[PDB]
Design a protein around this ligand. Sequence first.
Ligand code: 64K
Ligand code: SEJ
Ligand code: SEJ
Lengths: 346, 343
Amino acid sequence: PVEFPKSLRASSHSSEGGTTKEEDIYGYELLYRSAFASYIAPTGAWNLVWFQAADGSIKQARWYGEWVISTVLAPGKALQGTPLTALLWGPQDTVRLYYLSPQFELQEWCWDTKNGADNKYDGALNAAKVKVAPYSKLGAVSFGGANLRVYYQGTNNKLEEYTFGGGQGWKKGATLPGDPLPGTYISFVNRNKWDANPPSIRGYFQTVTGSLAEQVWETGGWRIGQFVIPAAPFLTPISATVSPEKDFPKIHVYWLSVESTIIESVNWHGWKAPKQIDNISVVKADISATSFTRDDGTVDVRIYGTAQLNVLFERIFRYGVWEEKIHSISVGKEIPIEVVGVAAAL
Amino acid sequence: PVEFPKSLRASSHSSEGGTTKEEDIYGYELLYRSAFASYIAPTGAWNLVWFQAADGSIKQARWYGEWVISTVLAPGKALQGTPLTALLWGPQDTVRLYYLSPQFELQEWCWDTKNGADNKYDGALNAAKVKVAPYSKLGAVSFGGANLRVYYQGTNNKLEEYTFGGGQGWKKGATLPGDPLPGTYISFVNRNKWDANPPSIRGYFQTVTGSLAEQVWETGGWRIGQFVIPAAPFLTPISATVSPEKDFPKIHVYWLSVESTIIESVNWHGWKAPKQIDNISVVKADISATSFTRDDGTVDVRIYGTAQLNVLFERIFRYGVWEEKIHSISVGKEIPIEVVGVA
Ligand SMILES: O[C@H]1[C@H](O)[C@@H](O)OC[C@H]1O
Ligand SMILES: O[C@H]1[C@H](O)[C@H](O)OC[C@H]1O
Ligand SMILES: O[C@H]1[C@H](O)[C@H](O)OC[C@H]1O
């Protein structure tokens, strides 16, 4: 079997007090510790998840009653281990996926479906040849329709913005405040509606001290926000999502504990205390959260990431509860492996 | 600060019972979880270590009285996250480094220093365009001088051999027995001397059950060996090294425990029980062991890998003990970060 820390739970079917003996799945055509991007439709009708396959291609899992896997970028387009982040607007017919080339330049994949179209193409951002720090992660927001903002880490480790819109093409934007950890995970959200202008932008990242910190844009410019987590694991995955709950933006910020369990902080008429959403240890690797508002004003959340041993998980927050069933989305060939909980080195 | 599990030690200056509060180093120009290859001179006179920088270039740390960093492969030559494995013979004037291209093909870097030359070049293995499983690791041995064997994981997840020597050029070699875990770390050694022929080859890998297993080549072909670890962490790093002690090959096999501490098993007139060499948790990432036989007859070992938070460590086994203060080799810019143990 494979050994796993006895005090940790590897899966939903682990013993209550940790892992004893169980079977878990190795999906070996998913890149180990793949990046993830995701977007659930604002109606909740369908879901998009993007990830990197073992061969380096970028693939898409689409849910509409069932999951369907497709390939959107061939091997060689993306850095092996590329970060990923996605945009969706129109309200829900125009999709963008940002990634890095093998030369560490910003790249953009476009999917346009307005008026019944089905057009996938390389975006204009590719031509700007924007070199980023090789360990940079990526975030992005959209507002006022097709005003786009891409967030990345520059070679001097500051967070940086690239902008699109108003007939200007892609242009360098702001340098953001703060002292980001080199290689920090980053996640940016827009609290205002997709067609509204100005936006209300929040970004979450890890600082050089290990704390989690918040970027804020409102009219008047960028500043460091009030969200402060004084200590977090080194290079902890971070993902945030926002959707209005009872007409007020509800931010969910997720990161990993030292046990690699998922911690959630909610902003909704103030920040609430961080809370572990379940006690199952995921693989310490990129996660991706997305959310939408139901007709009744309540907010659903989905989180995607890597579960033991290497499977694409889906966690579901629906009608006010985290569902106990944690789904897995098969993306290729798999082998089952016995896992045993072990308390010491030998 | 950054949080670290309280029951684990992040460094040799951690508290005895785990991490409480300490300062550790982030070398951010080292690729996080870089692969490592290494070779110490058979005389012990100097050391070579290869690793991947954050920008994807392959760099070399050479110890000759002091550590000196250089670049051997420009950015763009190697897969981001490439495995690495090295050969040294002549006894010590001919170096080969194997890696993967961004298209998952076997590649070879060559460094020839015979007669005071300084020739660095791409090797002929590149022309074979050997496509491997994208998560393949790499091993290699040399014997009889320039007879070379490169080991990798084929697209069907079997371990495979490519061969060089006898004026034949690079040719496909054996398909090895066993059922390897997709993406397993692998490490191959030659128990016989670099100029001897035939070789006595051993390889170490992880199976689809999670066990660790051993490949054996003697005259007659490949067989699965007696080295069996029934359970190990998923995709545990593995590295082995061999050098003679009292005129008998002493194999050291290293892998990581469930606490990411380094476990050692020695073969020297039989296998000895696995032993934790120290109780400091490294980053669960590639390690590289190398060894030489000192002129006094004892066997020195060096292990390289990633220590908290992201530094290139050197662990030293010398005169029969592991030195307790574990130092790092700087490869670029660094930042110190406070680490706190959390339960
Ligand atoms: O595990 C053993 C092996 O079975 C034998 O053949 O040679 C010495 C060790 O490598
Ligand atoms: O980069 C552009 C892209 O070419 C697309 O046409 O729409 C707006 C931006 O995403
Ligand atoms: O691949 C060859 C290389 O081109 C050089 O001729 O030395 C022997 C082998 O490493």
